[PDB]
From a paper:
Amyloid-β (Aβ) forms heterogeneous oligomers, which are implicated in the pathogenesis of Alzheimer’s disease (AD). Peptides Aβm17–36 and Aβm17–35 mimic two different β-hairpins that Aβ can form, the Aβ17–36 and Aβ17–35 β-hairpins, respectively. These hairpins are similar in composition but differ in hairpin alignment, altering the facial arrangements of the side chains of the residues that they contain. Aβm17–36 and Aβm17–35 are cyclic hexadecapeptides consisting of two heptapeptide β-strands (Aβ17–23 and Aβ30–36 or Aβ29–35) connected by two δ-linked ornithine turn units that promote a β-hairpin-like conformation.
Aβm17–36 is designed to display the side chains of Val36, Leu34, Ile32, and Ala30 on the same face of the β-hairpin as the side chains of Leu17, Phe19, Ala21, and Asp23 (the LFAD face). The X-ray crystallographic phases of Aβm17–36 were solved by soaking the crystals in potassium iodide to incorporate iodide ions into the crystal lattice and then performing single-wavelength anomalous diffraction (SAD) phasing. The X-ray crystallographic structure of Aβm17–36 contains 16 molecules of Aβm17–36 in the asymmetric unit. Each of the molecules folds to form a twisted β-hairpin, and variation between monomers is minimal, consisting mainly of Met35 and Leu34 rotamers. The trimers formed by Aβm17–36 consist of three β-hairpins in a triangular assembly with a cavity at the center of the triangle. Phe20 and Phe19 sit on opposite faces at the center of the trimer surrounding this cavity. The trimer is stabilized by hydrophobic packing of residues on both faces and by intermolecular hydrogen bonding between the backbones of Val18 and Glu22 at each corner. Two trimers further pack together on the VFE face to form a hexamer. Although the hexamer is not stabilized by hydrogen bonds between the component trimers, it is stabilized by bridging water molecules that hydrogen bond to both trimers. The side chains of residues Phe20, Glu22, and Ile31 form the hydrophobic core of the hexamer, with the carboxyl groups of Glu22 sitting at the corners.
Residue numbers in the entry:
A (entry chain C), B (entry chain B), C (entry chain A), D (entry chain C), E (entry chain B), F (entry chain A), ...: 1 to 16
Write the structure that this text describes.
């Protein structure tokens, strides 16, 4: 699965 | 909101 | 075109 | 992370 | 299917 | 434009 | 609702 | 950034 | 496949 | 139009 | 929730 | 990368 990154602060992973 | 990153060059934020 | 990034390991581009 | 809502009935969260 | 909601005014369903 | 809603806390609009 | 357009050939609407 | 187009009526831009 | 269009400037296709 | 598939049970089409 | 399928190899579910 | 499937006919891959 791919992991995208976003600033939520702190950077968080978004797993797909 | 979430801020994603993309190369547009320069790295820009993409807010959601 | 925009280029997003994801961890796939190694970081890969994703062009739009 | 954002939580979107959808009817699945009952309403469910969708966490991003 | 999932039914999301959006303001279009009136709140409409968006089926998936 | 459509306006979607998400919990972010508090509920926020997301315009499209 | 929003109507996007795409070539499918022929150009079609895509309603959201 | 990319600018997509949709009928909303009138044709509007959608900037990404 | 579907071909969407966006201004990038110049109008480009985006194939799906 | 493209038709994607999802388990909803039973597998359903999703046309685009 | 809908389950989409993708090849990651092996087929994996993607739950929405 | 992930490869999704859609009916386009024939079943085609859609790589991400």
């Amino acid at each position: 699965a791919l992991v995208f990154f976003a600033e939520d602060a702190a950077i968080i992973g978004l797993m797909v």
